[PDB]
Amino acid sequence: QNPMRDLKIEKLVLNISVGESGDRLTRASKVLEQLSGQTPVQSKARYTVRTFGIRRNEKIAVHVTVRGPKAEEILERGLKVKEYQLRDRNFSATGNFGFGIDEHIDLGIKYDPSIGIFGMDFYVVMNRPGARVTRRKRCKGTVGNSHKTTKEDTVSWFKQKYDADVLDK
């Protein structure tokens, strides 16, 4: 019984885990920039491993958060690449979902060898309306069980829209 329990997309965050800092990262950053239109954010390394050749606070990654119609736009632009085919996995038991795509040129974006080719992790966080209770300052509360996102309920929404796919157990 839902006249307002209609599943919107909260945000879509794109993430390039460029394993090191430098030119490669400022390039993946410029890609994210002309994929979002918003200045992306850089991520520093938490600790140091040295097998991955990284260092604490190395600024080894970039991401960008996009919400609304623009997010639906890029979401579809990537769904095409993945042929509208996902798996029973890839979905959080909490309702959200995401995929990954190497070959970032499949998103319309041209080649431009002065930047190279890069991969990207796509993560879509979904939520019904009134999710503001958990994110506001005053009276911050928890949404009812029946009202928050579910994994089966989200895959059902995903299939209904774009009829894309489920594909396995």
Partner 1 sequence: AFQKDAKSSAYSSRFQTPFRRRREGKTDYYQRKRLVTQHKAKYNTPKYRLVVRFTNKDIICQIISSTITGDVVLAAAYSHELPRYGITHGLTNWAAAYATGLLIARRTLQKLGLDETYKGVEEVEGEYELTEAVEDGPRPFKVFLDIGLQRTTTGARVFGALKGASDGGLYVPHSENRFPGWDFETEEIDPELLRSYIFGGHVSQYMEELADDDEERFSELFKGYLADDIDADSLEDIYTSAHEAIRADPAFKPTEKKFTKEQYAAESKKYRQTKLSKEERAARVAAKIAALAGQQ
Partner RNA sequence: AAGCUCGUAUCAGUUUUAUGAGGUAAAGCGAAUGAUUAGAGGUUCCGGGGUCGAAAUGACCUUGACCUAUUCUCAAACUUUAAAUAUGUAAGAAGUCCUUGUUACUUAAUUGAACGUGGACAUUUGAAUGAAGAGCUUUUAGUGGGCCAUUUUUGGUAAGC
Partner RNA sequence: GAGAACAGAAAUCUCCAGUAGAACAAAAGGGUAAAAGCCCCCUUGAUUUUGAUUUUCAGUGUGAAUACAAACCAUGAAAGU
Partner RNA sequence: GGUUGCGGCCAUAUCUACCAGAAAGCACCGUUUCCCGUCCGAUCAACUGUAGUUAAGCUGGUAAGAGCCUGACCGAGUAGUGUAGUGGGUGACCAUACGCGAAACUCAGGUGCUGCAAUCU
Site for partner 1 in 41-100 (CB under 8 A): 93
Contact between residue 124 and residue 12 where contact means Cβ atoms under 8 Å apart: yes
Nearest partner of 127 among 4, 2, 1, 9, judged by Cα: 9
Q: Does 8 bind partner 1 (CB under 8 A)?
A: no
Judged by CB under 7 A, which stretch of 107-115, 130-138, 157-165 contacts RNA? 130-138
β-bridge partners, 98 = 123
Site string for RNA, 67-106 (x = CB under 7 A): xx------------------x-xxxxxxxxxxxxxx----
Q: Does 130 bind partner 1 (CB under 8 A)?
A: no
Token couple for 88: 């029973």
- Look up residue 65 and give its DSSP letter: E
Residues in 45-74 that interact with RNA by CB under 7 A: 45-47, 49, 51-54, 60-61, 63-68
With CB cut-offs between 5 and 8 Å by kind, which of Mg ion, partner 1, RNA, none does residue 34 bind? none
Contact between residue 95 and residue 151 where contact means Cβ atoms under 8 Å apart: yes
